[PDB]
Amino acid sequence: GMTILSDVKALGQQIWLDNLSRSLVQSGELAQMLKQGVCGVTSNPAIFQKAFAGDALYADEVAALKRQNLSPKQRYETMAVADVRAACDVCLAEHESTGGKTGFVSLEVSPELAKDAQGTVEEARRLHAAIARKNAMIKVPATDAGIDALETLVSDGISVNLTLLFSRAQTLKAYAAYARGIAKRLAAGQSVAHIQVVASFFISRVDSALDATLPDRLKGKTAIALAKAAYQDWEQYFTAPEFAALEAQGANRVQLLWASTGVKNPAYPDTLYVDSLIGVHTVNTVPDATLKAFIDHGTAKATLTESADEARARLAEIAALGIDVETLAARLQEDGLKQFEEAFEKLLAPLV
C-alpha cells in the first residue's frame, strides 16, 4: 500500500517520479504526491516529447509562443522551464523541510552539448538562472565533457543530476570531480552545504543489452549486480579520509540515483529493480506505472547491500564470458544520447 513510500524513506531511500507534465502540476496531483511520499521529479527529452505530444494543456501555450519570434528550442525551453518552475514550487516545502536534501526537480541540457564542456556549463548556468529555484537540478550526461562541466558547476554552487551513468569507473571519476569543485569552494570560503549532486546510474538498459545472449543463471542479474557493486564503491569513496575532511566542513556526499528502473522484460516482476536496490543515502526515480506497481505489491527491505559477494561473483562471470562492462557502458551512454537527441528533434518539429 501507499505507506511503502514512507517505509522506504525509513530505510534511507527517496523515491522520485520519473515524469513531468503541465497537467501533472496544474491538476494538483504532484502536490498530493509530495504529501504521500514522493520526494522529487526527474525529466529528460523523451519525457517532455511525450508530455508535449499528449497533454492538452500545452496547446494554448504553443499557440501563444508561435505568435512570437522564437526558435523552436526557445519555445521548448519556455514550456519546459515553466513546468520545472511550477514543479519546484510544489516541491519547495519538502525541500526546505529537510534543509535542502530532498524535493528536487531535474531539467536536462540539450543533448547536442554532451561533448562540449564549456557549452554545457554555459547552458547549465543559464537554465539554473532561468528556473530561479533552489530545488532545481540541472541534468548533465556523464560524458568526459560532462564530468569536466560538473566540476565547474559545483564550483559555481549549482546542484547537478549527472545522468546516463552505466560505468563504475565513470561514476568514480564523477565523485572525484565533485570533490574538486567542493574543495575549490571551501578554499575560497564559499558555502557548500546546499549543493546537492546525484549520480543517475541506469539499470534496465544493461539487462536489455545483455540478456538475450547470457547463460540462464545470469539473465536479469547483471544490472542489479553492477548497481550493488557501484554502491560498495560509493561507501568506500565517501567514507575515506579524503572526503571525510570535506564532509566535516559541510560538504554533502553525492548520492547514487537508480534510473531506468521500469522493468522492460516481461519475464521479470515489474517491481524487480525497485525491490532490489533499496539502501541508505540513495534515490530511485520511477515512471508512473512502476510507482503504481511498487505501491500495490512492492516490498520495502534493505536489499541493496545484501549478498554483495554474489554480485561480485556474477560480475566476474560476466567478464569470464567476454562482456566488458566498461565497453558496454560507453556504448549504452552513446546510444542513450542518440535516443535523447532523436526525441528532442521529434519534440522540436511541431514547434517550428
Catalytic site residues?
139
CB contact burial 147-156 (16+ within 10 A = b; e otherwise) = bbbbbbbbbb
Map grid coordinates 561514476 to a residue: 171
Tell me how crowded residue 208 is: count the other CB atoms within 10 A of its CB: 14
Is the CB of residue 43 less than 8 Å from the CB of residue 80? Answer: yes
Tell me how crowded residue 77 is: count the other CB atoms within 10 A of its CB: 19
Tell me how crowded residue 252 is: count the other CB atoms within 10 A of its CB: 21
**Counts for the chain of helices (H) and strands (E), in that order:** 16, 8
d(CA 186, CA 255): 20
Is the CB of residue 155 less than 8 Å from the CB of residue 184? Answer: yes
d(CA 298, CA 291): 9
Is the CB of residue 65 less than 8 Å from the CB of residue 78? Answer: yes
CA 300, 304, 305, 308: dihedral to nearest 10 degrees?
Answer: 130
DSSP reduced 3-state for 215: coil
According to DSSP, the β-strands at 136-141 and 104-108 are: parallel
